[PDB]
Amino acid sequence: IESIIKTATDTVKSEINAELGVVPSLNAVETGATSNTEPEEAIQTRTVINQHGVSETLVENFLSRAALVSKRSFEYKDHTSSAAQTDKNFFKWTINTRSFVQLRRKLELFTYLRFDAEITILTTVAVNTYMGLPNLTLQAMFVPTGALTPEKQDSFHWQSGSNASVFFKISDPPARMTIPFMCINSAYSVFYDGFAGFEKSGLYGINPADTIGNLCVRIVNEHQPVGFTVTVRVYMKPKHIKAWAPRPPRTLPYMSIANANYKGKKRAPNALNAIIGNRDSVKTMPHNIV
Amino acid sequence: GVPTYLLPGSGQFLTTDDHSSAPVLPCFNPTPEMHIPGQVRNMLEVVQVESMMEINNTESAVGMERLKVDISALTDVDQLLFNIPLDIQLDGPLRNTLVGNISRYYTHWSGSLEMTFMFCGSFMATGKLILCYTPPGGSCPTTRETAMLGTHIVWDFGLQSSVTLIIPWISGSHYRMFNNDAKSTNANVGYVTCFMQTNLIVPSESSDTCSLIGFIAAKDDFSLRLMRDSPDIGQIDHLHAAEAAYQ
Amino acid sequence: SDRVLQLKLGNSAIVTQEAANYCCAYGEWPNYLPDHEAVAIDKPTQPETATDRFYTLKSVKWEAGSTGWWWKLPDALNNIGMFGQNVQHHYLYRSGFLIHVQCNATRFHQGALLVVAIPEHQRGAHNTNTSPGFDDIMKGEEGGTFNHPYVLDDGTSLACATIFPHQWINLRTNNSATIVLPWMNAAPMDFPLRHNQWTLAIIPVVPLGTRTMSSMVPITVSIAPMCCEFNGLRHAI
């Protein structure tokens, strides 16, 4: 039954027990229920007034940590003889939570998530001699998924009629935006057991309703006579979080961001056929006190 | 105007700060909330669900053979079957559990544990085991005379094929640390050992080697604090197709 | 008292005598879609006893080196009975499921099955970075076989798979498992031919073993849809 739990529960004292018909330490794993044997029923306990709060394991606290989701370095220079596969003073990024594995395993502890995401953008610059670091203006434009993204630094898509842009400088504090809960469903599917199109040639596991959008970031300045290397780090913090149906954590290393494929490490720990590193026997104690 | 002055800590980005920020989409209406089954509001709900221990974390135990302990009929009395190291920080049998994975996001822990053991022999298989918990201090007990002097439960295999060994919170401090020193007095929990109380006695058509499955959950006096990143996941390179999110 | 159980849905009934207390997933029971959560505005068809009835699948042979079996829902039932005809003639779909798994043997046999229902079981492939295709996922009535059930074929773990709605068939205790599933989706209704809400996984945690005469031990799966709605009537694909 649902109740409000602010601290961990208290222990009551117990006595010698010797009753027929009552066996609380015996259980039934086969029902799928966890054992309800209390510590008062297994040993003799004392009264403990437990004042240990439980507020740090709240799902709001467990997930609302600003985590790196994007890291992109591009050369900020005059791009005339640069190849067309490079970032000519701007980049595009489809917003995902799959690329960096600390937030990914943490969000994949749940099947469904409903959250607002606040987005911190940290820009840092390095000289590509030394003459000083420029205080450049960057534009981060939020483009929805599948819409027209800019193809140039100076394209006319950067004018942002209805697309939300943030203009920010390197010497400022980092730019911070709140992106709302933007799914067309009532929760994001962290896992999607399906195909996202009506044909049999779509992608497995990728629901585009889960995708936030594109993040097109340019430098508004023109090129200086020297080049610079600009690294843009994007940080996502979930907030106002509801979470449903928890899952086993991922044990094997991630291979891709598109799928849940697995290889495992070559030896234990976290190998395919051995998640926990090995000991000599089942009656061998690894860190035995001498 | 209002006379102000900036403090130390002005303009910084703490990753754990709790402020309101600018809406990127004004007058946006989120999707109406639907009831979805199984909402988790505290990660201690997850930690109280029993999950299998890899007690058989040995070589020549490949895959699912690590999730069961094979006991047999013995010809000597008072014999040790298995033992379980109780260090949740350290890569032992308790690491890949629901209580073990969520706790490695934290540094301090407190509260009682429970070990559930399900016997998976035949109906014809009889036997009695003793499941001892030893508070820390000395070595792990290797004989049954030594080990039953601590917290134990004697279990006969019958109509209920399961017991629970409550591992009580017996600590000097309020919390225990997930420090690297497993032999520390702030970290070492103690030992769990299993012995033959009588013997595994089967007839000639039961399989002579039977199995246990060990489970561990946390009780509702369990508590975790001081949050850290998990040592269970990590990368030394970008994942596959991560550059294609920029193309 | 909790060992005997008759499940009566439609013209189908199942009596069992060697059962456990059955599992309702996440404490929830199935229901129809209420008006304050509805999206599609046309009147749904609720065929009830024509579709809310047990559907028994093909049995699987529990053998020596079995790794496990999985069926995806509603994909395992999209071509069976009047459930499959309502699936193929409609665009939308909403139901829960009452899964009953049967496996018995003698009192000289041993073995344990983990019968676990997994929501949104997105699978992974082994030792490749190409995603699984359509035919790897949409098996249908026959279902599939686990390749690496120790990591649940998705890099996670079988040990922590008791966080999902599950039961056990330990052959010395019970011979059946029963899991009642509600609707488990982010959307209130769904297109049943490209998305699976539940995967029934049956996994040999303790293998089958005896020293008596060798009989075939089958594992039978009966699935009853519960509270079926169908919206978007058209032709059949």
Partner: peptide
């Protein structure tokens, strides 16, 4: 401190102490 006109702009809501572990630990019916 929320001077924005949208409700999702606000800070994190760390006051949800409602638990129900019995939907995972005792999901059996009787």
């Amino acid at each position: 401190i929320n001077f924005y006109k949208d409700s999702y702009a606000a800070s994190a809501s760390k006051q949800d102490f409602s638990q129900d572990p019995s939907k995972f630990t005792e999901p059996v019916v009787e």
